[PDB]
Design a protein around this ligand. Structure first.
Ligand SMILES: C[C@H](O)CNCc1c(Cl)cccc1Cl
Ligand SMILES: C[C@H](O)CNCc1c(Cl)cccc1Cl
Length: 284
């Protein structure tokens, strides 16, 4: 029985290696990675890979791995797929831990924009969880943490992490991680998957996919939103993506809204993640 080596970048930046049978469905590899991680609340997570166009794709656990990675390497990342709107309702601390690791990368990468003060507050909770109570011995007036807190580090940000870290004495790791999440979940881009697009008139927009629906970003004026329950049908055709909206009260007709994506793969990718969000957050 012929086996393919899989490599998975974990959220702590370490590499997990295993073998699966070459005709294996994605779920096989996902189950091995979650067992490695001691993760039971698996439904929020997934594996990604980079395609022949170097775009992020979710590995579909119900499809053969070989039919998704096709010509590319069997190289994956373990990621949060569905960001819970209320992480306090997760059953296990370890789930919250992995969600914090993902959010730390969302912040350092700049996918999750964050004010100076919230960068410092999130950093302070991470330091409190992982090192415990503040110790002056380790940190002089010139201390720079090894922890990555932001897309751009400043001395002033390091100073503020330390000042807030002092205020968390006695706080235990699950408690600090819960505080991390109670702050992070409020950020306007929390759990938003962003896709470049153009409207039916050719204006550059961004489409954001998240728990609360499909968001349309044009600039800093007029953020439109379609809550998932209003969305009856999502579809794609060539480079175009369409949403069918329920008729409003007393309206005779449904309305279809059309967008232009970079190419056909990008339209299919956006369709798939919208359908998955719609189903997941209908049920959650
Ligand atoms: C630098 C990595 O730790 C080792 N390289 C394997 C690899 C690559 Cl190149 C890309 C995405 C996932 C994986 Cl697993
Ligand atoms: C290349 C850089 O990311 C600039 N952005 C281009 C862009 C954006 Cl932000 C949104 C929609 C369409 C397009 Cl083309």
């Amino acid at each position: 029985p012929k086996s393919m080596q899989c490599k998975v970048i974990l959220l702590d930046g370490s590499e997990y290696t295993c073998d699966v049978e070459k005709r294996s469905r994605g779920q096989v590899l996902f189950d091995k990675v979650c067992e490695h991680l001691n993760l039971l609340e698996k439904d929020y997570f997934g594996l990604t890979y980079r395609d022949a166009e170097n775009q992020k794709n979710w590995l579909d656990p119900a499809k053969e791995i070989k039919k998704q990675v096709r010509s590319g390497a069997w190289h994956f990342s373990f990621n949060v797929k569905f960001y819970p709107p209320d992480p306090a309702q997760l059953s296990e601390d370890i789930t919250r831990y992995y969600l914090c690791l993902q959010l730390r990368d969302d912040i350092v990468s700049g996918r999750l924009p964050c004010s100076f003060v919230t960068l410092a507050l999130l950093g302070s909770y991470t330091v409190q969880s992982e090192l415990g109570d503040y110790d002056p011995d380790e940190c002089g007036s010139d201390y720079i943490s090894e922890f990555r807190f932001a897309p751009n580090h400043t001395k002033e940000l390091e100073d503020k992490v330390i000042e807030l870290h002092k205020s968390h004495r006695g706080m235990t790791p699950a408690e600090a991680e819960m505080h991390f999440l109670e702050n992070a979940k409020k950020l306007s881009m929390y759990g938003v998957d962003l896709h470049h697009a153009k409207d039916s008139e050719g204006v550059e927009i961004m489409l954001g996919v998240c728990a609360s629906g499909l968001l349309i970003y044009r600039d800093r004026l007029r953020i439109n939103r379609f809550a998932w329950p209003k969305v009856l049908k999502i579809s794609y055709k060539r480079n175009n993506f369409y949403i069918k909206i329920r008729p409003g009260e007393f309206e005779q007709f449904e309305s279809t809204i059309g967008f232009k994506l970079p190419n056909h793969r990008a339209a299919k990718r956006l369709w798939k993640v919208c359908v998955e969000h719609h189903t997941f957050f209908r049920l959650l």
